[PDB]
Amino acid sequence: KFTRSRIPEKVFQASPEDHEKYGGDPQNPHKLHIVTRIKSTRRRPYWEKDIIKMLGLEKAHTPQVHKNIPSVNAKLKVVKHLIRIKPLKLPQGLPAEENMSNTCLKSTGELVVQWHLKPV
Amino acid sequence: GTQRVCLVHPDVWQVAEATALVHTLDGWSVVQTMVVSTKTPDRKLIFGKGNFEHLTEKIRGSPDITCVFLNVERMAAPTKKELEAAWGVEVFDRFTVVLHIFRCNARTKEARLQVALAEMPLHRSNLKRDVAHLYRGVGSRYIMGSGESFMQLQQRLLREKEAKIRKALDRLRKKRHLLRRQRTRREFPVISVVGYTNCGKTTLIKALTGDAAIQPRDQLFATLDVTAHAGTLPSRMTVLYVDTIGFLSQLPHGLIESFSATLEDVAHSDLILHVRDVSHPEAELQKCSVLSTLRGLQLPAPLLDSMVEVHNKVDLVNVVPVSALRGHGLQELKAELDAAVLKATGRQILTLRVRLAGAQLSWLYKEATVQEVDVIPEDGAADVRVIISNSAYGKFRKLFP
Amino acid sequence: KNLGGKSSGRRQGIKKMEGHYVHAGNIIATQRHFRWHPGAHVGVGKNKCLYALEEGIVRYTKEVYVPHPRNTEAVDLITRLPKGAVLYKTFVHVVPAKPEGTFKLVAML
Amino acid sequence: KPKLRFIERAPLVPKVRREPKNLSDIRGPSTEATEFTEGNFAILALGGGYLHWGHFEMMRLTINRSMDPKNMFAIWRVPAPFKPITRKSVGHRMGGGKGAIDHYVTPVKAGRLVVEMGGRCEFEEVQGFLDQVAHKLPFAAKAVSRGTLEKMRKDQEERERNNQNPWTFERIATANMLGIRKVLSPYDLTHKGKYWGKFYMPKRV
RNA sequence: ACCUCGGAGCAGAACCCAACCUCCGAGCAGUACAUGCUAAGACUUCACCAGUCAAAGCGAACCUCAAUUGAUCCAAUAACUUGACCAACGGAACAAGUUACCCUAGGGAUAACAGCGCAAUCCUAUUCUAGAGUCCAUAUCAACAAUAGGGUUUACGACCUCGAUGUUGGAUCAGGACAUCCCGAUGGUGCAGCCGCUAUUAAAGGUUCGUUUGUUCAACGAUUAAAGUCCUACGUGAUCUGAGUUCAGACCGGAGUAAUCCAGGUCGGUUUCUAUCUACUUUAAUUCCUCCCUGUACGAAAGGACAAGAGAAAUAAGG
RNA sequence: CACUUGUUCCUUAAAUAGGGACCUGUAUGGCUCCACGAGGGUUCAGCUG
RNA sequence: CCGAGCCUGGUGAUAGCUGGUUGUCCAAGAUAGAAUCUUAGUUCAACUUUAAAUUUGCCCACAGAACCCUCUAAAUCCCCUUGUAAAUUUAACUGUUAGUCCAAAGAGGAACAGCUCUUUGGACACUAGGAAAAAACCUUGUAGAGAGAGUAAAAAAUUUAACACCCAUAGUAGGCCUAAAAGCAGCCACCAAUUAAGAAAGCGUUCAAGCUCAACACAAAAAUCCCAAACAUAUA
Ligand SMILES: Nc1nc2c(ncn2[C@@H]2O[C@H](COP(=O)(O)OP(=O)(O)OP(=O)(O)O)[C@@H](O)[C@H]2O)c(=O)[nH]1
Ligand SMILES: Nc1nc2c(ncn2[C@@H]2O[C@H](COP(=O)(O)OP(=O)(O)OP(=O)(O)O)[C@@H](O)[C@H]2O)c(=O)[nH]1
Ligand SMILES: [Mg+2]
Ligand SMILES: [Mg+2]
Ligand SMILES: [Mg+2]
Ligand SMILES: [Mg+2]
Ligand SMILES: [Mg+2]
Ligand SMILES: [Mg+2]
Ligand SMILES: [Mg+2]
Ligand SMILES: [Mg+2]
Ligand SMILES: [Mg+2]
Ligand SMILES: [Mg+2]
Ligand SMILES: [Mg+2]
Ligand SMILES: [Mg+2]
Ligand SMILES: [Mg+2]
Ligand SMILES: [Mg+2]
């Protein structure tokens, strides 16, 4: 019978080689995930459909910010084959009230708080 | 597989023969014997009602009886049906039992084909019972399809199977002729060893040839394949003994005649050797049975006339008494076989003077059996006493004038 | 040749898993054999069903098994047990939540 | 008794209850009779299948005839046929109950030893007819000595260690990457893609 | 054969799971007479009906078993209570056969023919090297088995068609495959020659007439160079035939009380269609035999050739 | 007495067709074809697309 | 137009059976079983729709759910947090309850079927792209116009068998065995000479003899007619 898959915990224990490859320090982990649905929930189990709806990833290629916490991570583990997860980067820090209207999420995963649309 | 059988022998030795037949099955055990006399062998019930009721009550009272072996050549369909209904167990006759042992022992494709031909009558007899589970009540109301009914279709299929078997057996006969071509061309004398079942044909051939691969079994109908083994006679002549299938009495002729494809090697034999089991109480009946079986097989009349006889199993107790296992009269038997092959194959034992040069002596060695060579060095020649066939003599006369 | 075997499932098993608030009289688990044994504040019916004798929380534990001395089969099993061996069984417990009652001032005589 | 023992067609006490065809007994790697015992050569099953009394007779006759009894000995590493296989009458429509017991087989799983030979001989003397038997077996089989079996196991381990493919069936199946467990079987999590039905892919890493 | 109820696998771990699936069982028995009355809260066979457990309380002492059964109405009884192997077991209060004399509504939800899936069965080829073949696996075969291929048999499935896909054979015309029966070329041979056997290649051409039987088949007669295996809607009924099968009539044998039926035998028994569309409608031959070689080669004899040449015919095509 | 189990004879070159015998078992309503028949089979000779 | 006439009437007989069931537009909408003279139907359940009341609904952390059985699957139930916004209840209803393939666990069959039967899930009974055409495989879904753009899945790979050359005297025909059995029918031992040779590993001999060897020396085929055309070398 086809059932829900229990991912062994060893899969989610990064190695030093993984750290070097993907550029992430085990200490000081990132706070937020940018998650984009890159796969259709069609032809996938209803539980994956429901998890996608819960995470609010109904539209494909639409980034969504999520907490990097154990429960959200469990849901993302359930639907990990349909999504792309990246760490949200804040080169200029968190947006403030003043610059809340000038933000932009660049394809690199950086939320720039000044968007001038002018040459550097 | 496993069968406990009650041996019901009608009467008008044979019990011992039927017991041996049962034992041959390797899983069939005789658990009861009933010799019952009757004056009407041909009837729906072979026995008069007085004996029939006693047999029925005895059989049904005995619970170990899985089947009954009626020592009759072949029981008709009504007789089988009535006996089955009365005795509440399966009924087997000589035909069925012999057919079963033939099927069990048959190992070669030729033997399997021949026993299938032998079975064909059994399949025809049991057609109704073998197809009763396929009727499904379909016929005469379904308005389309071939006009053949269920039984007509089954009979057609059985006939087609029999035709296939007969075609295959004809091909086998052709192939056997092809195989015999070479031995016939090189003029090997052929002696076909025939006789009653279990009379010692295989053992005698083993004793004569000296082969060790020959395995004379204790069970009946051990040899189901016609096979040729070479041996040497006192005259240094090589003779080919053909071991054949044994014959049984009170058995349908068709069963054995189904083996004619492989038994035709007997017809092309130069001599026939009847192995009489003299120790057996019914040796005379065995002789009658085997002679009738050979006549049915249509062996050449000259060959049947020239048939030699050897009394095997003489140790247990005009001809040559022999003991195959002990090996008592083998040398004598070989002497008479030598004489018989000389007078049958048209081989002349003659002295022949040859110049000791030109390879005439080597030619004579290779194309004839040089019994002896007396050499005259003064004339530089040799007189060879040799057993030479007519063809070899003609070849020599032309080659070396 | 094979007749019968058409009986449906008894729908037996645990009705209240651990941590479930249970009111007095609730059936905790229905069983054909003694899978879970009665614990504190848990009663057994004629058909071996476990019902809550008090209002509280269901807890499943593993506790040593000491049959009644008149339970001949269990006593024989124990008599045949090697020294040092202790049987264990799963027991169902109801940890009562509310107190039996409170003392209230009813009249200031 | 150096020569190989005779094997009966069916158990002496015949089974009465028809039992389901649990093909799992053929499927997957073999966990029994996987190591040599009192012998140096054997026939290894590189696949799953059922051995009939016909196969047993073939093995017995060939090995007995081709061996040297005074310098070689052979022993079965597979039990006599015990699993009953039932066949209905020819021409029978579907239904009407399970068929009557027809034959007995012995399940064999890939990686198991079928016959084991030993004695004062080397591999080359026996590999010939062991390979004949293996080729005539119902499943893929190979005549293997202790040394050759260890060599092939070490070769498999070496291939697993030095494979340059970043992606392995084991990794992908265990992590459920791409959601491939929707297409795989629960058995695949332990077969690691090296087994497919009764077939054992040996080159598969 | 089964129809209701329970236990165990399938269904390994909360629950639940089909099967004309594998196995076991039940239609009670026994002990007590508080086997009394009441009452929170729960379970529940996937509905309902029904079935389960039960604290506390009154009253008393100081129920075993898995199933072990059945509603309403209606009867008997003063009442309490009792009543169906209603087992087709959610139970019509009480009703069987046969229909080819049949009819109607439908069904390709479902059979017969056909197609199609499958290849158990069937056929074929290789592999092993046991065994036949005097010796010799491999001239020819070939057991136990293994691996492949085909879709001609017997089957199974029920996917199209029951507001019709007309049915077995035969006539007529034939199209195609080659796994070749003959004619052609070649290798081997247990090929001395003639007959042969086997294998590779070859589908241009050909592959008979009759007695019996509806015979497709089969037996037989006479031939042939051969009288090939198949597929084509078991090719071909808007081209034909209807002898069988397979309507309504009637007998004989069997079954039944009978109607009537039967995988028994038989005598008789309506064969429609004027063509709208597609398609199509004038495209260097084979073989046998006689003679000669030659009674030669070959062969101990018996028997008996190739190749080359000559002559005769037959069929087919075209005139 | 009738019908059934097998063997055989005539008829044809050839017959699962037609006719005639003998041989095994079943079963006061069974045998007997004189004449007749668009009845069902077999056949000599002739005839003829 | 007689298995029982015809006409009229009851009569618009009845039909769980077939067929038909007529404006526009939007929205929700495929889902366990039980009983049934019942499996071509219906009632209840489940699902579905609408409106209303209320508050928890789904996902799910530990902890927890059996021995029989020695071991043993994917998993399941329960479940705070968390991500989400749905859930239960009330009122009123219909319709679906003759289903297909795919992956997986199995059963029956023959470890056949486009076969049949359960379970988990998917898809189809809805749009679109792809796998050639294509219900069930892969991608992808919420809908309009555009003569813009980035992508998803998405194109099969393979070509396979040569091989040693030279040389051989001999204790003896090792014993027993057997008529003989001589390296070679079988059993025992299997030593030993020549620099170099097994009391012999296969042929062959009735038996011998003659041959070697070891030893020195230096993949496939079926029926109307194969089936895009082609292409090895211009920088992912
Ligand atoms: N006492 C004794 N028995 C003998 C003799 N000859 C043969 N036998 C036995 O008779 C039986 C015959 O066996 P085979 O010789 O194989 O039989 P066959 O003659 O081939 O006959 P089938 O078994 O029918 O093929 C065996 O038990 C032999 O041992 C003899 O001279 N004396
Ligand atoms: N509960 C119950 N009712 C019955 C029983 N026997 C008969 N009845 C009632 O009577 C009906 C059956 O009628 P019948 O079959 O004629 O009964 P009977 O007793 O055999 O014969 P009569 O007395 O002639 O009616 C049922 O449907 C009930 O109404 C029974 O055993 N139990
Ligand atoms: Mg014999
Ligand atoms: Mg059950
Ligand atoms: Mg309920
Ligand atoms: Mg009912
Ligand atoms: Mg009639
Ligand atoms: Mg009608
Ligand atoms: Mg059909
Ligand atoms: Mg259909
Ligand atoms: Mg179906
Ligand atoms: Mg139409
Ligand atoms: Mg060809
Ligand atoms: Mg007609
Ligand atoms: Mg007429
Ligand atoms: Mg007629």
Ligand SMILES: [Mg+2]
């Ligand atoms: Mg017409």
Ligand SMILES: [Mg+2]
């Ligand atoms: Mg005629």
Ligand SMILES: [Mg+2]
């Ligand atoms: Mg009228």
Ligand SMILES: [Mg+2]
């Ligand atoms: Mg109406």
Ligand SMILES: [Mg+2]
């Ligand atoms: Mg909508």
Ligand SMILES: [Mg+2]
């Ligand atoms: Mg969109």
Ligand SMILES: [Mg+2]
């Ligand atoms: Mg050498």
